[PDB]
Amino acid sequence: NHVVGRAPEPVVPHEQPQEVLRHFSAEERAMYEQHVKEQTSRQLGEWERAM
Amino acid sequence: CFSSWNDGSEGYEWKSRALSEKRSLALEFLGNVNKRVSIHDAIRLKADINKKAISNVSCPSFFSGIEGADEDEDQSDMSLCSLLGVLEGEIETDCITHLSPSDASLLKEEFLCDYDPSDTKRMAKWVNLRSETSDYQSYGAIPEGERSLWSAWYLRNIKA
Amino acid sequence: EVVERDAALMKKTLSSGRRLRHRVESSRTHRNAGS
Amino acid sequence: KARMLNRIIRSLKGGERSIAEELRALHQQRKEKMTMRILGIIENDVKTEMEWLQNMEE
Amino acid sequence: PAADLSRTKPHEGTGTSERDPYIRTLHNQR
Amino acid sequence: AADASLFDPENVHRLENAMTHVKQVFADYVHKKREGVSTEAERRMLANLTAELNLETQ
Amino acid sequence: TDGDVYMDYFLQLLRGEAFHQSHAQAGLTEAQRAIEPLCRAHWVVHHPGADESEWATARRSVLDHAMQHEREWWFPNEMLDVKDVVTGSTNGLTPQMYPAAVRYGVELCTVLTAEGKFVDERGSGLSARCVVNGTGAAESVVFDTANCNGTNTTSVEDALRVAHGALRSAQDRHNTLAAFRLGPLSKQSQVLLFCGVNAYEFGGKYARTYAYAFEKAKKELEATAASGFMAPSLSHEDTERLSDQPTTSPSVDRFASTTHPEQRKAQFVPRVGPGSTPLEDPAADQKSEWS
Amino acid sequence: ITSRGQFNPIHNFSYAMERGVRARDVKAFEKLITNPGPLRVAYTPDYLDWLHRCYKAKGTYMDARAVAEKKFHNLPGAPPPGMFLRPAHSFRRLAGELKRRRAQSILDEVARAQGMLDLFERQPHFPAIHIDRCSRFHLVELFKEMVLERSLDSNMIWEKALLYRAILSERKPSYPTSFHYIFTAVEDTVFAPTISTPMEMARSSHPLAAKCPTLEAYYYYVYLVKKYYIDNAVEAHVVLRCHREPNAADLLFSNPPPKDDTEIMKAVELLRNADIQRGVAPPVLPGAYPPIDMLWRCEENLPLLKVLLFGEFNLIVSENPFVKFPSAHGFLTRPYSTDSSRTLADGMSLANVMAEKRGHLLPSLPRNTATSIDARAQDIRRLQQKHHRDDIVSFQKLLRSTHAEDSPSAFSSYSDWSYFNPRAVRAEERDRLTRKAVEALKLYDSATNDIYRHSFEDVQACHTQRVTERDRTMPPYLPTLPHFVAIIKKDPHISFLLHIGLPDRNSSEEGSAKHKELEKRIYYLARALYHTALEYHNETVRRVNRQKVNVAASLLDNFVEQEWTTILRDKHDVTDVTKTLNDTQNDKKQLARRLGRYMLFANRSLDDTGFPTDARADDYTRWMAPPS
Amino acid sequence: DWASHMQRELFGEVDPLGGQAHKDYYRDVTRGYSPQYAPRNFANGGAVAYPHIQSPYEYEEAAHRRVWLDHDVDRMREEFTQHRASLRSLASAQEREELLRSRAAEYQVANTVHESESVHPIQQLYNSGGTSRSALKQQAVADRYSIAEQHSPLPLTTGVDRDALDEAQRTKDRILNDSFTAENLLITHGLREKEKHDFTILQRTVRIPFQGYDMDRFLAQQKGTPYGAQQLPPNVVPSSMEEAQRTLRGSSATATPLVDAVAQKVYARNTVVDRPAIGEQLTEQIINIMRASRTTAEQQREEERAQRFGLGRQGALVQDGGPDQRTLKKHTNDERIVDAMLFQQNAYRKTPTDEHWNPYIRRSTENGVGHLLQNKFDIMRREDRLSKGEQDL
Amino acid sequence: TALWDATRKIRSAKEAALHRSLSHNTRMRASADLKHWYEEDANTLRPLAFEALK
Structure with a gap:
């Protein structure tokens, strides 16, 4: 009833937990954030285009 | 885990650790003769500093209701007396359902009763709470036949 | 010989010790000097 | 004890549902207190045993 | 404590997880 | 009524096992709280064990 | 002790460039000042014969370009550059690290890219500029037509010629950059290898062994070329004569008691291979070399 | 090199020491530390006695060095406990001593600059300065x-x-x-x-x-x-x-x-x-x-x-x-x-x-x-709310503790004092000075192995054990960042995109932007691979670095496949004659098609060298599984 | 607003915090020593939200990055002094603010901060429980080196010299060899098949798990993927401030180079010691301390390896009953055992393929497929199959 | 594009010669190491563009 017509949860490949995000450096953290942002944006855009 | 504490085969990680530490303590007490030495000043100082270091630590515990009470903390002691007259106008004219007798007893317990070391002893008594060192601290509890390498004397108190 | 010589040469760096440091009364509006 | 209990009692005395949620919150606090005292006796036993073992090792 | 960077025989494994069992029960053929 | 999980055997041996497990984890936590070593794993284990212990105490 | 200021020290401090910099020297940063000799050498090699006036009229321009774009060559590389010429071969470099050093240098020069520009000296004054990756290829070649006047009458061959000239300039620029990057390390390695032959397999008592191995390798390669590009068996089983197998060839047996069994084994106890087959001394049908 | 409570000197008495000036008593030392000009500075008693001890140590070291020169427990001219001294007029020893002089000069300059910054930061070491003897x-x-x-x-x-x-x-x-x-x-x-x-x-x-x-x-x-x-x-x-x-x-x-x-x-x-x-x-x-x-x-x-x-x-x-x-x-x-x-x-x-x-x-x-x-x-x-109170007091205490003295690399830092100083340094010039000091120390340590030598019989026994290329040399494929860059950029698809696949950078601004992004992703992946190779032997660090490799490779492969699809679909041909003449010879489209499938960098078996592993896939996955 | 404030602080020639010992600000060693925002997150539990360095190689990478950017910061500081002169000439607050925001936009200072890009509720919680993006914007003390690396060519050297790489390779080989021989000793003792037997005897007490009637639904519910099935992780108790800071400090303390560590330690002690030194004496002390530390480290590594593997004779060299008198103990390492296992592996081995005369041994895939691969066509086919995910032929 | 194709041809020729040598050599094949196929890849062989001028 509340899930009809909604995008699937965006799943970013090679998602990492905080236990390794803490070991990720600043540049590595920026790269990871850019990767997850791009994946989420492209998946939501694909769902919007399909709908 | 909740399902790793029932009396069965689950919880191997801690069950094996418990058995191994019991056997290690028994072997150290019985066979290890190097740890039979009259203490000296170095041992006394090391024991004192170790006791202080152990004492200065605290147990970690976070509880939602306790922290919710701590948020309010102290407001006023005469606030109840002041608000009695304030609620005289409204609450008295409004019907108030009587609480359960169990809840009344709970309120009486929470106010009148204060935690005691005797209460802690009773709490540790209604559970078996067998100490890891009770047998070694008792007097003449270790039989000559049972103080052997493969004798399972330290496991005698285990009951399903 | 080299072990003994290194130990003798390095004991002073291993145990250098401490010295007393002079303390100056800290004024509220400035820093007091000394000589 | 003097502040929290008095405040909740006087605030939620008028509303029956409010007093019921106050009672259930009090029960939750009591359960947390009992768990805390169990952890306290556990901590004391662990401290005593560990200190004795440390002395034996020393 | 299974060692890392270890070459194991194809008929067995370290046993760390399901994907690497102690004994491989799945064939490597088609 | 016939549900086995409904019975919920209220026997103190589960509490005994919980006490032993939390004693072991607490001893490890205290020992690691002496040599300046991170106790994140011990704290998360304590969180899980104390949640289940709160259930048992209820 | 008397509190007198030393005249010589005061004059030295006054004449020192540290306290008051000249305006020209102030523009250059510490890195530019440190790499100035290398940039000057790489400039005078491309401009054979250079005076101080013509060097200084573009020192700042060349230094800024070098730092902005081609920073990898000039910036000191700890793996490549040498601090002391006298002890660069001995302490700066070691025999174990020399192949690693040269491999690092060649890989870095392979991935580093240079740039080159050419201008036509015939007809229209069109120009081209192109970058080269170091493998000989180009990532970008472009033409500038803004300088060209209002003709637009140049043909395809002129553009091809100016592109070829730009490519040649870029290739020469990259070759010179690689030479300047790898020079000192190569020279120190040369002197190290020449003077430390005795600390090597090709120097001293083992030079004769190395020469013999080289000659036998040449002979074996010629034999392989003769025999259909298929190498002779490691154990010389295809040799028709027993005098043709080398002494070092695995054909010759080493077991004591070449006649009595139970003593022709490598280890203390006889071993078996896959299943129960013998392992110490296989048979001809057992040592099948299919595929 | 400066700590939170350093005592960087501000006076240069090495000139006086080399000219023979010797402060005998406290009055002589004060006359040395006096400044005969503008900008007078008052010191503290602790700083003064520290400077006096430093001066006495300098004098004792200078006379010991003079004794060693005359000879030309252990004097500065003595060899290390297991080394021997080369002849004075030898090329190696002269170069080593020149490096020693250079390193010591750099260290002295760094110390003087640190002292000047400390003086102008108004640290407690110098309580005050006065400008009475100054003109307009x-x-x-x-x-x-x-x-x-x-x-x-x-x-x-x-x-x-x-x-x-x-x-x-x-x-x-x-x-x-x-x-x-x-x-x-x-x-x-x-x-x-x-x-x-x-x-x-x-x-x-x-x-x-x-x-x-x-x-x-x-x-x-x-x-x-x-x-x-x-x-x-x-x-x-x-x-x-x-x-x-x-x-x-x-x-x-x-x-x-x-x-x-x-x-x-x-x-x-x-x-x-x-x-x-x-x-x-x-x-x-x-x-x-x-x-x-x-x-x-x-x-x-x-x-x-x-x-x-x-x-x-x-x-x-x-x-x-x-x-x-x-x-x-x-x-x-x-x-x-x-x-x-x-x-x-x-x-x-x-x-x-x-x-x-x-x-x-x-x-x-x-x-x-x-x-x-x-x-x-x-x-x-x-x-x-609960931890705000405890965090403030504990943080201040930890900075001024014995742990800071024991490990000053992490706990001790300049501009970390409890009090506020509006004229605090930017901590960039101090970082540069620390860098100069550490590089001078490295140069001095390099020169100290050149000044002295080992025994002739020891080096003879060393040379009796020859070095062979087969097993006694470092592998040519040691893990370096250009080494991991070259293998990635020599891939046919990567090389195609870098050279001709992407639009020309100089001509097209969007082509330049795409080139910048491609280079950034390639560098990220290469850096992750380099770190993984360096920490390959350490299990947990290898796992986390392999996770970094996975992230970087996924990002790079997403970009590469997007660019490949765009350059395949950009068939902007106005007339069919253009299409025919493009198909006549090897154009960008046909060269891209000839290469074939693009192998994703995420699905690869590189290990410690950038080369595919010889082990089985199961073993490689077990090695490169994410940490638990 | 925050970008303008950060650009003004970067323009200023003073510490943004004025050297104050501020909470949740860390004087990172890798990032020179400029302060950085490291809040102590409580959603993860007493954890400092700041990168934790692992290797001195990463330390040297950061240091050489600062060396590479040293050129950028000088020209940037010249531009900053020009901008400060322009601000001093300016007299209107609105004009100053407009110039500050324009310069911040040009320098891309707002890109110094990094925002958590997450959509999953748990990932959003882990960052928004405490310091959200608003807090990131507020406590965003920028760095000149960060601005320099915002727009600068990427270095490739990594700053590790030939000696450092030689030492790294030597220690890597040593650690790998020691781990391999320890594992071979464990296998020779046979405790690995003891582990397998323990697994076999443990399988008796197990029971078949419940995969659910709808197996896909049950697996999804276990993963927490379907709508309404998300379960938050337990709220772990935060650590003490001392422990939270100590772990982060030790992360860099164990990753510092020996030369830098000893130099910092001796310079810190020089103020307190009763015999302070200046210049050449301090340099000699540093060199002596470094040499002593190196030789002691070598001795300690050798002694620990010898103790672990039981190396050396067991007592007197010259006994009445022969010089070789070893007393083997059950499930214990010994030099004789290691030598015996090496002898069994490679007694008279000339090549690894010495026993490959028979196809059954030759085609074994235990060690690897390197010997099985013999041509570039096969190598490319194998790598293509591995990249595509299908089984290697 | 033509220059890139020519460089690709040169590199492929060098790597193919390396492959021929590796496949025809058996003494090296006795060493069961895949490393030799990647060690001297088509980037570190003797004909070098940055050494062409010399």
Whole structure:
């Protein structure tokens, strides 16, 4: 009833937990954030285009 | 885990650790003769500093209701007396359902009763709470036949 | 010989010790000097 | 004890549902207190045993 | 404590997880 | 009524096992709280064990 | 002790460039000042014969370009550059690290890219500029037509010629950059290898062994070329004569008691291979070399 | 190289030592440390005895070195315990000694620069400096070198100078004898009756009167000092930084209750009643000020410039003004995270924040999960409130502890002291000086192995064990960043995109942007692979570095496949003749098609060399599984 | 607003915090020593939200990055002094603010901060429980080196010299060899098949798990993927401030180079020691301390390896009953055992393929497929199959 | 594009010669190491563009 017509949860490949995000450096953290942002944006855009 | 504490085969990680530490303590007490030495000043100082270091630590515990009470903390002691007259106008004219007798007893317990070391002893008594060192601290509890390498004397108190 | 010589040469760096440091009364509006 | 209990009692005395949620919150606090005292006796036993073992090792 | 960077025989494994069992029960053929 | 999980055997041996497990984890936590070593794993284990212990105490 | 200021020290401090910099020297940063000799050498090699006036009229321009774009060559590389010429071969470099050093240098020069520009000296004054990756290829070649006047009458061959000239300039620029990057390390390695032959397999008592191995390798390669590009068996089983197998060839047996069994084994106890087959001394049908 | 409590020297006595000057007693040492010129500096007894001990050690080392030269427990000229000394006139030894001299010169320069920065940062080591033996040129040079350079605002300079004069005049009785000379300049400071002229006209003004701003501003600053109990330069700086902001009622509210405005006005009026006699013999914020160019050019403000320099180089006391102005801490420096959450307590609900971040395209946060999120957010707020008190006190204690002395690399850092210092260094020049010092130390250590040698029989036994290329040399494929860059960039698809696949960078701005992004991703993947190879032997570090490799390779492969699809689909041909002539020979489309499938870098089996592993896939996955 | 404030702080020639010992600000060693925002997150539990360095190689990478950017910061500081002169010439607050925001936009200072890009509720919680994006914007003290690396060519050297790489390779080989021989000793003792037997005997007490009637639904519910199935992780108790800071400090303390560590330690001690030194004496002390530390580290590594593997004779060298008198103990390491296992592996081995005369041994895939691969066509086919995910032929 | 194709041809020729040598050599094949196929890849062989001019 509340899930009809909604995008699937965006799943970013090679998602990492905080236990390794803490070991990720600043540049590595920026790269990871850019990767997850791009994946989420492209998946939501694909769902919007399909709908 | 909740399902790793029932009396069965689950919880191997801690069950094996418990058995191994019991056997290690028994072997150290019985066979290890190097740890039979009259203490000296170095041992006394090391024991004192170790006791202080152990004492200065605290147990970690976070509880939602306790922290919710701590948020309010102290407001006023005469606030109840002041608000009695304030609620005289409204609450008295409004019907108030009587609480359960169990809840009344709970309120009486929470106010009148204060935690005691005797209460802690009773709490540790209604559970078996067998100490890891009770047998070694008792007097003449270790039989000559049972103080052997493969004798399972330290496991005698285990009951399903 | 080299072990003994290194130990003798390095004991002073291993145990250098401490010295007393002079303390100056800290004024509220400035820093007091000394000589 | 003097502040929290008095405040909740006087605030939620008028509303029956409010007093019921106050009672259930009090029960939750009591359960947390009992768990805390169990952890306290556990901590004391662990401290005593560990200190004795440390002395034996020393 | 299974060692890392270890070459194991194809008929067995370290046993760390399901994907690497102690004994491989799945064939490597088609 | 016939549900086995409904019975919920209220026997103190589960509490005994919980006490032993939390004693072991607490001893490890205290020992690691002496040599300046991170106790994140011990704290998360304590969180899980104390949640289940709160259930048992209820 | 008397509190007198030393005249010589005061004059030295006054004449020192540290306290008051000249305006020209102030523009250059510490890195530019440190790499100035290398940039000057790489400039005078491309401009054979250079005076101080013509060097200084573009020192700042060349230094800024070098730092902005081609920073990898000039910036000191700890793996490549040498601090002391006298002890660069001995302490700066070691025999174990020399192949690693040269491999690092060649890989870095392979991935580093240079740039080159050419201008036509015939007809229209069109120009081209192109970058080269170091493998000989180009990532970008472009033409500038803004300088060209209002003709637009140049043909395809002129553009091809100016592109070829730009490519040649870029290739020469990259070759010179690689030479300047790898020079000192190569020279120190040369002197190290020449003077430390005795600390090597090709120097001293083992030079004769190395020469013999080289000659036998040449002979074996010629034999392989003769025999259909298929190498002779490691154990010389295809040799028709027993005098043709080398002494070092695995054909010759080493077991004591070449006649009595139970003593022709490598280890203390006889071993078996896959299943129960013998392992110490296989048979001809057992040592099948299919595929 | 400088720590939080370092004692970097400021005097150069090596010249005197090499010329033979020897301080024999305390009077001689003080005569050495005296500066016979401008900018006199007063020291502290601890710093003085430290310098004396350093001087005595320098003398003992110099005479020991002279003894070693004459010979030409263990003297500096003695060899290491297991080394032998080369002949003095040898190329190796001469080069090594030249490197020794260079490294020591660099270290001395670094120490002198660190001492100069320490002196001009107003650290407790140098309690004060005085400029009594300075001329107008020296005063203007100091002004330009410090105040004008480090001040972004010109009007703030005027405010600071007037506040310094006011606070100095108010605190005049409580000062040592050496601070009397500045009061002459304080009195000589000239103010202009700017407000008098409009009243007379009802506006001609002298240029010398215009150069000095006014006297009502000085009265306002005296009112400010009386109100806020200003007694030192750190609190002067704080109250001058955060008084123009429209929150001085609460932002500048001091921890002690401020004096009454009527009392302050009465004090100001009494001071004016004395000042008018001397001249014959709540105030609003001050207005505009004359330019600092006029300030440093005219000599009418020369006493004001001198007192400004005196206040800038003095009145710096090691104390935190935030104990006196607790609210001003959040404005002066970044507030605590717990306080930030307390201020943004009206952040609505964390469930609402999550919903607005996720957007409308997704399911709207099931109610049980939203309740759990809100409960967790409240618990986090409770934890922050509980730990805010403990964190502040514990953090200060840990900095000044024995652990900082034991491990000064991490715990000890400059500009980390408890007190506030408005003239703190940027910690970039100090970092550069530390870098120079450590590189000089590396050069000196390299030269110390060249100065001395091993035994001839030892090197003979070493040479008897030859080095072979087969197994006694480092592999040519040692892990380096260019080594991992080359293997990635030699891939056919990567090379195609770099050279001809992407649009030309020089011609097309978007082509340049795409080239920059491609290079960034390639460098990221290569760096991750390099780190993984370096920490290959360490299991946990290998796992986390392999996760980094996975992330970087996924990003690069996404970009590469996007670009390949775009360059395949960009068939922008107006006419069929163009298509036919493109298909006639090898164009970009056909060269891209000939390459074939692009193997994803995520699905690869590289290990410690950048080369595919020889082990089985199961073993490789077990090695490169994500950490548990 | 925050960008303008950060640009103004970067313009200023003073410490943004004025050297104050501020909470949740860390003087990172890798990032020179400029302060950085490291809040102590409580959603993860007493954890400092700041990168934790692992290797001195990463330390040297950061240091050489600062060396590479040293050129950028000088020109940037010249531009900053020009901008500060322009601000001093300016007299209007609005004009100053507009210039500050324009310069901040040009320098891309707002890109110094990094925002958590997450959509999953748990990932959003882990960052928004405490310091959200608003707090990131507020406590965002920028760095000149960060601005320099915002726009600068990427270095490739990594700053590790030939000696450092030689030492790294030597220690890597040593650690790998020691781990391999320890594992071979464990296998020779046979405790690995003891582990397998323990697994076999543990399988008796197990029971078949419940995969659910709808197996896909049950697996999804276990993963927490379906709508309403999300379960938040338990709220772990935060650590003490001392422990939270100590772990982060030790992360860099164990990753510092020996030369830098000893130099910092001796310079810190020089103020307190009763015999302070200056210049050449300090340099000699540093060199001696470094040499002593190196030789002691070598001795300690050798001694620990010898103790672990039981190296050396067991007592007197010259006994009545022969010089070789070893007393083997059950499930214990010994030099004789290691030598015996090496002898069994490679007694008279000339090549690894010495016993590959028979196809059954030759085609074994235990060690690897390197010997099985013999041509570039096969190598490319194998790598293509591995990249495509299908089984290697 | 033509220059890139020519460089690709040169690199492919060098790598193919390396492959021929590796496949025809058996003494090296006795060493069961895949490393030799990647060690001297088509980037570190004797004909070098940055050494062409010399």
